[PDB]
Every structure is written in C-alpha cells, then in structure tokens.
Homo-oligomer: A and B are copies of this chain.
Amino acid sequence: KQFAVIGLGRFGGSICKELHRMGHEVLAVDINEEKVNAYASYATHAVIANATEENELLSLGIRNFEYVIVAIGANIQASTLTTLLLKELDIPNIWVKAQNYYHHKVLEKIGADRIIHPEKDMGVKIAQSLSDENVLNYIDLSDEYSIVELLATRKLDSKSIIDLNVRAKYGCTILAIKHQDCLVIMGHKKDIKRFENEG
C-alpha cells in the first residue's frame, strides 16, 4: 500500500513517522519548506508542494495512492479545495482532519470518506479521565457499554477475584490485571460506575 499525507503538522507528522516505522511508502507533502526538510528523512518521498493546485497534484503521481490523508485542519479553504481535487482525481479513500462542526459539514458534502477530529476525540477522552481519576483508558463498544481499564484502589488490595462479585452483583466481567494495579473491566456504563464507587 502507498499512502500520501498532505500537511505535516502535529497530526500529519505523526502519521508519516508511524507509517514509515511500520515500513510503508509514504508521500509527505507540505507547503512549508522547513517542515518538509524535517520530515524528509521520515518519508519515502517528501515534496514541497501546494496541494490546492491540480497541476502540482498531478506532478506527484497522486493517482497512484490508494489512501490520501489531508491533515490540514486550521485552513478550511486549503482543506476543502484539496479534498475536492482528490475526489475529482478518483482517489478511493480520502481521510480529512476537520476543524469544527461546520468544517465537518462541508467535507461531508464534497465527498470525504472519513473525517477525523483528533483534538476533539482526545479531549473527550481526557475529560473522562479528569472527572473520574480511577479510569486510565477506555474504549466505547456502544453508547452504553465500555471496556474501562480501571485502577485498583486501596480497598481492592489483597482481594481475590472470587471475593469480588462483579459478575453477578454489578454484572461486570473482569478481563485482565496488570501488576494499585491496572484492572481491565467490561460492563454497562452505569454498572461500571457502581463498581468504582463501592470498590
């Protein structure tokens, strides 16, 4: 697979370094000369180009890339003009980083295959950890069930699994323990909060 990442910011620069670490052909495009020089070593091909121009986009052979990631999320004009061109060039998969709710609505009309909010998805994830310090990481299977990696408190010390009645009393299934030790649990959103309060 060949990937193109347009815009080497904090978000796009992470995708170039990660996909290059896994051993993939990454094209790194950025309008900034100093950004491309820094990520020149972290990409298979790095070009100092403006992606809002169709002539520059055809010069890169952008039609040969199955996945194009437009990591521009502070310039709505540059981001929407780029993903309109890539939809014109018949790119199978265009993934765009959005800025606000209105930028999400423009890109949904002009044909973005997946629209990503990196700071909004992390900020909600961080604020869940701020509100309840017991949690460390979670994944939402649905809107009401989650796999919350809880942190064992002082009252859970020296307590066996059979002593815990999470299976029946709370209806929560413990998955793993990482030796205060990390306690991975699964259950309803309201049911897990009962186990956090009562230990």
Number of copies: 5
Residues A76 and B81 in contact in the complex (CB < 8 Å), given A123-B10, A147-B175: yes
Residue A36 at the B interface, CB < 8 A? no
Count class of interface residues, chain A: 35 or more
A119, B10: Cβ atoms closer than 8 Å? yes
The docked-state distance in angstroms from the alpha carbon of A129 to that of B105 is 23
Residues of A at the B interface (CB closer than 8 Å) are 1, 3, 9-15, 18-19, 22, 24, 52, 54, 67, 69, 71, 73, 75-77, 80-81, 84-85, 88, 95, 99-100, 102, 105-106, 109-111, 116-124, 126-128, 130-131, 137-142, 145, 147, 149, 175-176, 178, 182, 184, 186
| 16 A-B contact pairs sorted by A residue (CB < 8 Å) | A1-B131, A10-B73, A10-B117, A11-B123, A14-B119, A14-B120, A18-B124, A76-B77, A76-B80, A110-B110, A116-B122, A116-B126, A122-B122, A141-B149, A141-B178, A147-B147
